[PDB]
Amino acid sequence: VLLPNRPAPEFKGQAVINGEFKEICLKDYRGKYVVLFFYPADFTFVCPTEIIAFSDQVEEFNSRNCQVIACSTDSQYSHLAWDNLDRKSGGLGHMKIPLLADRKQEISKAYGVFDEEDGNAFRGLFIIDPNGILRQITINDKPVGRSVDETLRLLDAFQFVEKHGEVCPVNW
Amino acid sequence: MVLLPNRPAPEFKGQAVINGEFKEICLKDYRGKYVVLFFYPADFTFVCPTEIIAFSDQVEEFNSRNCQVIACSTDSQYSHLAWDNLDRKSGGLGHMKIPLLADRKQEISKAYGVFDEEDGNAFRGLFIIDPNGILRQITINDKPVGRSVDETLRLLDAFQFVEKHGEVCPVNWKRGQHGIKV
Amino acid sequence: MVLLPNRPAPEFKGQAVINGEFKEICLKDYRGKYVVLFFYPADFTFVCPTEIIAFSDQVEEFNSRNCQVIACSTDSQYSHLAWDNLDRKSGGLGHMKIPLLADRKQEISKAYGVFDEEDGNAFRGLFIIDPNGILRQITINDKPVGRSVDETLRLLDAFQFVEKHGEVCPVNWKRGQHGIKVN
Amino acid sequence: LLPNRPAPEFKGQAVINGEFKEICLKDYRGKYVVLFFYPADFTFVCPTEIIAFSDQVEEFNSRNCQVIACSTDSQYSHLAWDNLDRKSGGLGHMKIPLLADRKQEISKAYGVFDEEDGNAFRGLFIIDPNGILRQITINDKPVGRSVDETLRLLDAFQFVEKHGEVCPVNWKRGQHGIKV
Amino acid sequence: TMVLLPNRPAPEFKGQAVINGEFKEICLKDYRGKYVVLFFYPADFTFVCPTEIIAFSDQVEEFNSRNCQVIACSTDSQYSHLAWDNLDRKSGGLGHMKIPLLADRKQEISKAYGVFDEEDGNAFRGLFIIDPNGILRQITINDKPVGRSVDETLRLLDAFQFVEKHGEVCPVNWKRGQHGIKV
Amino acid sequence: LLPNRPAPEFKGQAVINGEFKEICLKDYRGKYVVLFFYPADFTFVCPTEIIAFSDQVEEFNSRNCQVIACSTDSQYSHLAWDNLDRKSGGLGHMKIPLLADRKQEISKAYGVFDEEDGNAFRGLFIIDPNGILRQITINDKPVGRSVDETLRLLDAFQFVEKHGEVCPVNWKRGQHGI
Amino acid sequence: MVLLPNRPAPEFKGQAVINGEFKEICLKDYRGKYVVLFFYPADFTFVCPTEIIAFSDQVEEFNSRNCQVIACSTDSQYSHLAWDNLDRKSGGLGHMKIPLLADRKQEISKAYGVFDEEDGNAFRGLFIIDPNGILRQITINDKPVGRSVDETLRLLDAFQFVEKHGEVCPVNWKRGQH
Amino acid sequence: LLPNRPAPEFKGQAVINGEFKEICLKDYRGKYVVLFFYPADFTFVCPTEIIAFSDQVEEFNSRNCQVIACSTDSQYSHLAWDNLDRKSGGLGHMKIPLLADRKQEISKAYGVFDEEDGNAFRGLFIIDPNGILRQITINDKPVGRSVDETLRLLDAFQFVEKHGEVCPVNWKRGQHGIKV
Amino acid sequence: LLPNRPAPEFKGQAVINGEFKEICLKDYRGKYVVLFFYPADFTFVCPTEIIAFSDQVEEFNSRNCQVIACSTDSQYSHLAWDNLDRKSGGLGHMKIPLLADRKQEISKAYGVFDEEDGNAFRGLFIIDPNGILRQITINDKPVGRSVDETLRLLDAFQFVEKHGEVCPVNWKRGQH
Amino acid sequence: MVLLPNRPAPEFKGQAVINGEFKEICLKDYRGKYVVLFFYPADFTFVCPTEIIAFSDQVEEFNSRNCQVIACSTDSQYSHLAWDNLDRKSGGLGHMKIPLLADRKQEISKAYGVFDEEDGNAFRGLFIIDPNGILRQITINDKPVGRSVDETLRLLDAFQFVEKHGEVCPVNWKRGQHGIK
């Protein structure tokens, strides 16, 4: 049962970072906020636009001490090819955020974003606080994408509370 | 565990406060319209009214978009009413243009997955539901932290665009903006 | 089914409003004392305040008898305080001399068996608890009909009588009257 | 066991006027019933309660209420207790029915049964004309009930049933109820 | 408990009995060293039951000299038993009984000896002869309308004491003192 | 196993007048039935009882009762015993049916079956014409029963059946009940 | 359902009639000796005695062979005695030179699987048990058809051969051969 | 397994006079059956029985009895064994059916199968013309059977069948028998 | 998964000659089917097997056999891999259908699914015109298969289906 | 369902015929060596002996490669022996240079999942087991169609190349060829 006040599910797996394979886990990221967002498939249409947007804006999350990780049920071998593929040919260009592979479906299932019809995940966005605890849960229907600006907004409010202890109003 | 989009949204029937009166509303009354259903933990709290006041003041932007906004909580109807009739300067809601849905039995909060056993009251979810009663968007916050009337409006525009034009909405998608075909 | 006396009363812990402030109270904080715990369905209702007020005005009679009176409802602490802050002229609680216990998790109402699945509201029960936490009297009234402060005190007197004198109290027993010796 | 629920059914041999007659809860439809329990025949607090209720019977007869006393003793023990005069420690002669539960079925259904004992805790259940439970009182054995509070509770439920109104704290006959 | 069987330890009973107009708590281990004739009756203030109890009480010294305690049991409370005893026989009472009246109000005892009736709430008429070591010997169950035989109860008791002492066995229709069959 | 309930059914092979016949409880409907068990054929206390009833048959006959003796022995062990002379240690020849239950079904149905040895305890059961049990009597093996008490109880049950009255303690014939 | 003969034989313990008095015996008593344990349906029947009489007439042939023949049935020890003490003229056993084992509790016949649930009796079994308690031969016949002392002798001869000489025995193998 | 009963059904591939045929217990209805099991093909003691039963087959055929040998070996093992001459350790050419049970069902059904070495003990089961179990013989493996005893047992079961009487101990053919 | 029984059914998206097509085992009745699995797209040993079966495709077509390659990759990944030039490590444009299992249920039915990684072991299943299984090959991942042995095997089963005669050890074309 | 590779192969222990005498063999005995364990339905069959004879005629190709070939069927040991003894003109096995493993109990065929409940016989499996007892290959043929010694050798070569050189063999790979990193 996925709720904001509880420890986030541990994810572990193989990711593509700077054109190489590295093995990452949620516990590595302690001390930082983590934005973990799922997309349905590699070589899709709406999906690359999101990953590219977050990558181009990665420094916004870096300055905010947040690590953005993009997970999908494709293999690391697709993640790599898709990264090696230039944006004109339909590829990802080269990405500044890790692309995490769930070939086991374990990660998409643990976060409850897994779709039994497709075999691939919905689009979740989960903001995990530095202590490994879930904060925000966003799940979008596949046709409709997310907002880098709203993720930045939320990220800023949660940080505002962990520091000030005042609680954040609407439209913040 | 957590709700999924592209699946029929959980049914809610409840007693609600509309224009200072009690009405019994359900989900199927709003068929033909989108429904933004958003939860808050408690009446006579602080972060809570600021969101409802905002959704209420902006309600015409949802109305023009063929959407109903319904706030729900685990408080009774007489709390919803008392809070409503109280002026905002007294920390009340002022008089409210959006229905306040009382879930006393915890049924609706537990159905949408936003109920937590620690408080006895709801996390703030925001769910967007299509005219056929199908779930589209899911948002849940840790409640120091509130939601955005502009992002709800945005998402609203996006799903309406998809259903209308059969195209899909990219990242950061806006109004009068291009989608992608199939 | 429902409770039986001469058995330890169900425990409770929760957020209560006392003198316009929040405080955590539990059944065990009241040990060495009798406890009258009574339930009402909702805040900002009609029959509910009349009872709360009544028990509050008469508090001293419960205090001199070594009893703590505690009102409980499935509303919250925040709903409770807003009610207690209001003027009675405005339909409020005035200001309350007894703790208002928030049942919000619903688990106090269920423990005492007074919980109504239809409205998600508590019925009106009243429970007399001895200084060791034993259950003595049980009353549950249907919602539209309210309770009696003087009958509660009458029963409270009776149980203290049999406690002190080890006697038994006959029907319609009145304060100071002495009962039957089971000697 | 809550109010605004159908009251449990009871059926059994009762002592009425000094004869045995089988009674059931449905017989009393249209009438209010006060069903009250006592632990034992030939004891101390028990007769005083029955006697008081019997002396006051007409006060209930004016409310369209039937009072019934139940316990886990036999009909044969009930009868001999009635035949015994009060000066002898008996019931005198009763204007009220004594319902016997030898099977413990009835005590257990109303949840007043004590398994350390074999006999009932003293409960009082006011049941409305349609067989729907209204009030529930259960006293620990050493402490008996009040005839006068039972009349008070009774007056209130009838006042709600009539005016549709609701009865506040300490409500007695000839007082204003709060409008719905 | 389809049926009890002889040559097995008798079911234990501990209860509250009326002995000489007073309440005593007695158990089966208390009478260890002695035989026990334990017999059940359905109800106090009835027809056949007193005639049975009065008859065992009038003949009680025949059992005392045979080193056997007689106990009557029923599902009535100790308070019924005491009122039935204290009542004179003219009124339908018990006179005053020289045997203990055992109250089993929990039905445990009558259920344990198998004589309890579900359609009733009171016991059938059992008669169980129990040897000094707690072993069951004879089992008699009569339908309620028909009563028992104090003289036949005495005959069997005599028989088991003969068997016990002389290591012989008692034939059909065996009368007290007669030689039985060796080995 | 209680007096107010219908009795267990038994169907078995019995020895009636030196021959084998299959009998069952429903045959005896309309008549009273005294069914009693003995542990073993060819023992000391068992025949005394069987003979006692077999000599007394006309008291049961005139009372509309049939007396049947059951045991875990075979019908063949029964018949041999019944061929034997009492002088020889046998049964002589019996006026009452000897019911063989070799399957233990009957003894177990009536709850008198001992698992320590394969022999039944000696019980005695009185069944009214309608198949309803009345008396249960079970004795430890070394101690045998009384024809006179069985006869006494017979009169008692028939009395209450007939006159509607209940029989007091120590009741005998020529006495009025309650 | 059946027990198989590479395996330790089921234990039996009961009351036996030996020499005319009751003795309690078991299967571990006869360790060091071979055992032939055979079952018959009932005492005081026609076909049963002929088998026991025969084997008991053959005793020294089983004795010289270090084997103990044992009869068993579901009858009581008291039926065994009466039958043994009976003359052969009345259908009795005469006085037997082999033990008569009683199974009252039926557990021996059930352990060896010869027990018939239809009648209370057992079929005719024959089980040859080696000195260490292991089962070797299993013979079971329907009631109407009896056994052979010669064949039991042959198998015994063969089973004793195969252990001693370590050679396997062919079909129709006789008192010594090869 | 007890012989008042219906015998367990067997159906399998048998080798009969050089051919593979499917046979079942129901086929031999109307006839007696001697069904005996042996542990292995190309063993020692087994041939001796199979051959002696084969050479003596006319005594069974005149008695209206079919002799069937069953093993857990394949039909292919059987045929080759039956092709092998006796001097060479084979079955010669034998006149009796060899029933092959590969899946162990049959041997398990008659209870002569042991999971130890995975091949059958030697049972011999006599089955009346209606398919009813009559005699059960089970030999430990080292020790073989008797054709002459099986012939005796068979003569007795038929005698009982025809004349309604029984067979005493050591009954021979044309002996008296005991009337019931 | 024994040879003599009807094969597990598959249904799903495939990339056939640049298009997405829904295929299932029953579509191929009247034809033999070689359904072979590989762990992942954009791997190393995997493309060599597909390209070889694709290059030899006419050998199977004249033998009345359909070759389908299944992976646990998406149809979208299959598409790009086949849009990828061989020199660049892709499939060129390959002449056999690429069957997509996202739900893993095809690889689970045929038994070749690995829990260790989300990828299939390389199985090769030969299925007859009536949908009955014929032969099972399962290779450990690091070692690939042979197009000539599949061709040999396929030839043999067609020989028994035709002549009723049995193919012995090392049987090659038209022996008997 | 099915045996998977890169997993420890099921243990087998039985009575086998080697050289014409019985011997007790087991999988663990062969540790340190590669094992090809292959199944056939029956003794005294037609397709079956051809395969057995072929592996026993080719036995040196396997010994050179450090592999023991083992033939298992559901027949007993005495059937294996009589078959091995029978001359090939009578349908016999000639005499075998490879162990004939008897599964009377069916445990082995059931462990390797090649057991056919229909005939009680076994299918034709061929399993390549590595020196550490791990299963690198599963080959199961429908009965009417027999296996290939050369493909078995090819596969054997391949799993040895990958273990030695840590590379991965492509399609159609034979001895002397290169591989991929």
Q: Per-residue DSSP letters for D1-43?
A: --SSEEPPP-EEEEEETTEEEEEEGGGGTTSEEEEEE-S-SS-
Taking the C-alpha atoms of residue I150 and residue D59, their distance in angstroms, rounded to an integer, is 102
The closest alpha carbon to D93, from D104, D107, D83, belongs to D83
CA distance A139 to F135: 78
Q: What per-residue string of b and e applies to E57-69 under the rule 16 or more CB within 10 Å gives b?
A: bebbebbeeeebb
Q: Which of A135, A146, A153 sits opposite B142 (nearest CB)?
A: A135
Strands J100-102 and J13-18: antiparallel
Partner residue opposite F147 with nearest CB, options E124, E151, E172: E172
SS3 J3: coil
Q: How far is I85 from chain A (nearest CA, A)?
A: 12
Phi, psi of J5, deg, nearest 5? -75, 180
Handedness of CA D66, D72, D76, D81 (dihedral sign): negative
CA–chain centroid gap for I108, Å, is: 15
Cα distances (angstroms) measured from residue A115 to each of A118, A121, A134, G19, I71: 6, 5, 21, 86, 19
Q: Is G133 on the interface with H (CB under 8 A)?
A: no
Asked if C1 and D111 touch (Cβ cutoff 8 Å), the reply is yes
SS3 G68: strand
Cα separation, J129 vs F71, whole angstroms = 70
User: What is the Cα–Cα distance from G7 to A120, expressed in whole angstroms?
Assistant: 60
Angle at I100 between CA I99 and CA I106, to 5 degrees: 90
Q: Which residues pair with A10 in a beta bridge?
A: none
Tell me if G39 sits within 8 A of G122, measured CB to CB.
yes
Task: Dig out the tokens for B1 from the structure.
Answer: 């565990």
**DSSP assignment of F37-101, as one string?**
E-S-SS-SHHHHHHHHHHHSHHHHHTTTEEEEEEESS-HHHHHHHHHS-TTTTS----SS-EEE-
Q: What is the dihedral of CA E96, E97, E102, E105, to 10 degrees?
A: -30
What is the distance between the alpha carbons of residues D145 and D126, in angstroms, rounded to a whole number? 14
Contact of B76 with chain C, judged by CB distance below 8 Å, is answered with yes
Pairing of strands G124-129, G135-141: antiparallel
Q: For domain F1-178, which CATH number applies: 3.30.200.20, 3.30.70.20, 3.40.30.10, 3.30.70.260?
A: 3.40.30.10
Our answer on whether G and B touch (3+ beta-carbon pairs < 8 Å) is no
What is the sign of the dihedral through the CA atoms of C167, C173, C176 and C180? negative
Cα E115 to Cα E141: distance, rounded to the nearest angstrom:
7
Shortest distance, CA H86 to any CA of chain J (angstroms): 14
In chain C the first and final C-alpha atoms are separated, in Å, by: 34
Resolution in A: 3.0
State which amino acid sits at residue F158: Q
Q: What's the CA gap between G96 and G72, in Å, rounded? A: 13
Chain-chain contact of D137 with C136 (C-beta, under 8 angstroms): no
Nearest-5° Cα angle at B79, B73 to B81 = 105
Nearest CA to G12 out of G60, G64, G71, G58 is that of: G71
Give every CB contact of residue C18 below 8 A, 6+ residues apart in sequence.
Answer: C25, C99, C100
> What does the alpha-carbon distance between residue F142 and residue F162 come to, in Å, rounded to a whole number?
36
Interface probe, candidates D10, D13, D45, D74, chain E, greatest E C-beta count within 10 A: D74
In the DSSP assignment, the letter for residue H36 is E
Cβ-Cβ contacts under 8 Å for G60 (sequence gap 6 or more): none
DSSP string, chain A: ---TTSBPPP-EEEEEETTEEEEEEGGGGTTSEEEEEE-S-TT-SHHHHHHHHHHHTHHHHHHTTEEEEEEESS-HHHHHHHHHS-TTTTS--S-SS-EEE-SSSHHHHHTT-B-TTTSSB-EEEEEE-TTSBEEEEEEE-TTB---HHHHHHHHHHHHHHHHH-PPP-S--
B45's CB contacts (< 8 A; 6+ apart) are C78
* Exposed / middle / buried, residue H99 (Cβ in 10 Å: 0-12, 13-18, 19+): buried
Distance between CA I124 and CA I54 in Å, rounded? 15
How far, in Å, CA of G137 to CA of G169, rounded? 14
Burial of D178 (0-12, 13-18, 19+ CB in 10 A): middle
CB F14 within 8 A of CB F3: no
Q: Name the β-bridge partners of C36.
A: C69, C128
Architecture in CATH for domain A1-172: 3-Layer(aba) Sandwich (3.40)
Please tell me whether residue G102 adopts helix, strand or coil conformation: strand
Token reading at I74: 């998406």
Domain boundary assignment for chain F: 1-178
- Provide, as residue numbers in chain C, all residues whose Cβ is less than 8 Å from the Cβ of B13: none
Q: Which of F89, F68, F47, F98 is nearest to E172 (CA)?
A: F47
DSSP H166: B
Chain B neighbours, 3+ Cβ pairs < 8 A? A, C
CATH of range C1-183; options 3.40.50.720, 3.40.50.920, 1.10.3720.10, 3.40.30.10: 3.40.30.10
Largest distance between two CA atoms of chain G:
48
Tokens of C173: 């027993």
B121 contacts C104? CB cut-off 8 A: yes
What residue type is assigned to position H18 of the chain? G
E strands in chain J: 7-8, 13-18, 21-26, 34-39, 67-73, 100-102, 124-129, 134-141
Quick one: DSSP state of residue I8?
Answer: P
Q: What is the dihedral sign for C-alpha D52, D55, D61, D66? A: positive
Contact in structure between B74 and B45 (CB atoms under 8 Å): no
From the candidates D24, D46, D65, D167, which is the catalytic residue? Answer: D46
Q: Which of D114, D133, D143 sits opposite C169 (nearest CB)?
A: D143
Angle (CA) J156 J160 J166, round 5°: 140
CA J88 and chain centroid, separation: 21
The structure tokens listed for J127 are 């399993």
> Is residue B122 within 8 Å of B73, Cβ to Cβ?
yes
Dihedral sign, CA of H37, H41, H43, H45? positive
The verdict on a CB contact (< 8 Å) between G172 and H52 is: yes
From C115, C38, C113, C44, select the one nearest C74 (Cα to Cα). Answer: C115
Vertex E164, ends E158 and E166: CA angle to 5°? 95
Nearest-neighbour CA in chain I from A115: distance (Å)? 9
Residues with Cβ < 8 Å from B137, sequence gap 6 or more?
A138, A139, A140, A141, A144, B5, B126, B127, B128, B155, B159
CATH number of B1-182: 3.40.30.10
Task: Please answer yes or no on whether H135 and G150 come within 8 Å at the CB atom.
Answer: no
> H135: which 2 tokens?
């005699």
Count of CB atoms situated within 10 Å of the CB of J33: 15
Euclidean distance between CA atoms C41 and C34, whole angstroms: 23
Q: SS3 sequence, F90-151?
A: CCCCCCCCEEECCCCHHHHHCCCECCCCCCECEEEEEECCCCEEEEEEEECCCECCCHHHHH
d(CA J94, CA J100): 13
CA distance C34 to C133: 8
- Looking from the CA of A150 toward its CB, the CA atoms found within 13 Å total 25
Among the partner-chain residues A74, A90, A102, the one whose CB lies closest to the CB of I77 is A74
**Does any CB of chain A come closer than 8 Å to the CB of residue I79?**
yes
* Cβ within 8 Å of residue J138, ≥6 positions away: I136, I137, I138, J2, J3, J4, J5, J125, J127
Name the residue among J116, J140, J145 with its Cβ closest to that of I156: J145
Beta strands in D44-153 (DSSP E): 65-71, 98-100, 122-127, 132-139
Catalytic residue among F24, F46, F70, F167: F46
Phi, psi of G22 (to 5 degrees): -85, 125
Q: Which residues of B fall within a CB distance of 8 Å from C82? A: 43-44, 79, 82-83
CB–CB contact D77 E45 (8 Å): yes
Beta-sheet pairing, G13-18 with G21-26: antiparallel
Interchain CB distance below 8 Å, G50 and H169: yes
Q: Could you say which residues from 23 to 52 on chain G have a Cβ atom under 8 Å away from some Cβ of chain H? A: 46-47, 50-51
Note the Cα B96 to chain centre separation in Å. 14
The b/e string for F146-176 (b: 16+ C-beta within 10 A; e otherwise) is: bbbbbbbbbbbbbbbeeeeebbbbbbeeeee
Question: Which DSSP string do the residues of J80-122 spell out, in sequence order?
Answer: HHHHHHS-GGGT-----SS-EEE-SSSHHHHHTT-B-TTTSSB
CA distance B119 to B139: 19
- Whole-angstrom distance, CA of residue F102 vs CA of residue F114: 14
Inter-CA distances, E177 with C84, D20, E158, E160, E170, Å? 91, 50, 8, 12, 10
3-state SS of chain B is: CCCCCCEECCCCEEEEEECCEEEEEEHHHHCCCEEEEEECCCCCCCHHHHHHHHHHHCHHHHHCCCEEEEEEECCCHHHHHHHHHCCHHHCCCCCCCCCEEECCCCHHHHHCCCECCCCCCECEEEEEECCCCEEEEEEEECCCCCCCHHHHHHHHHHHHHHHHHCEEECCCCCCCCCCEEC
Spatial contact of D171 and D164, defined as CB atoms under 8 Å apart: no
> What are the C-alpha distances in Å from D42 to residues A95, B4, E106?
92, 68, 18
d(CA D66, CA H53) in angstroms, rounded, equals: 95
How far is Cα G139 from Cα F166, in angstroms, rounded to an integer? 63
Distance CA B125, CA G63 (A): 95
Whether domain I1-176 has CATH 3.40.50.300: the reply is: no
Distance CA(C165)–CA(C160), nearest Å, equals 9
Report the CATH superfamily, name and number, of domain J1-181: Glutaredoxin (3.40.30.10)
**Distance (Å, rounded) from C-alpha C71 to C-alpha C17?**
10
Is the Cα torsion angle F16, F20, F24, F26 positive or negative in sign?
negative
CATH superfamily entry for domain D1-180: Glutaredoxin (3.40.30.10)
Token pair for B181: 């075909």
* Chain J residues closer than 8 Å to I150 by CB: none
Which residues on H lie below 8 Å from G5 (Cβ)? 121, 138-140
**CA dist., res. J113 & res. J108, Å (int):** 8
The single-letter code of the amino acid at B38 is: F
Rounded (10°) CA dihedral A24, A26, A30, A33: 110
Q: Do strands I11-16 and I98-100 pair parallel, antiparallel, or not at all (unpaired)? A: antiparallel
Contact J34, J27 (CB under 8 A): no
Helices assigned H by DSSP within chain C: 47-57, 59-63, 77-85, 107-111, 149-165
| Total residue count of chain A as it appears in this document | 172
Buried b (16+ CB within 10 A) or exposed e, C85-117: bbeeeeebbbebbbbbbbbbbbbbbebbbbbbe
Spatial separation of the C-alpha atoms in residues H151 and H173, rounded to whole Å: 9
D20 contacts chain E (CB < 8 A): no
Cβ(A34)–Cβ(A66) below 8 Å: yes
Task: Convert G77-94 to b/e letters by CB count within 10 Å (16 or more is b).
Answer: bbbbbbbbebeeeeebbb
- The residue type at E64: N
Which residues on neighbouring strands pair with residue A140, listed in sequence order? A123
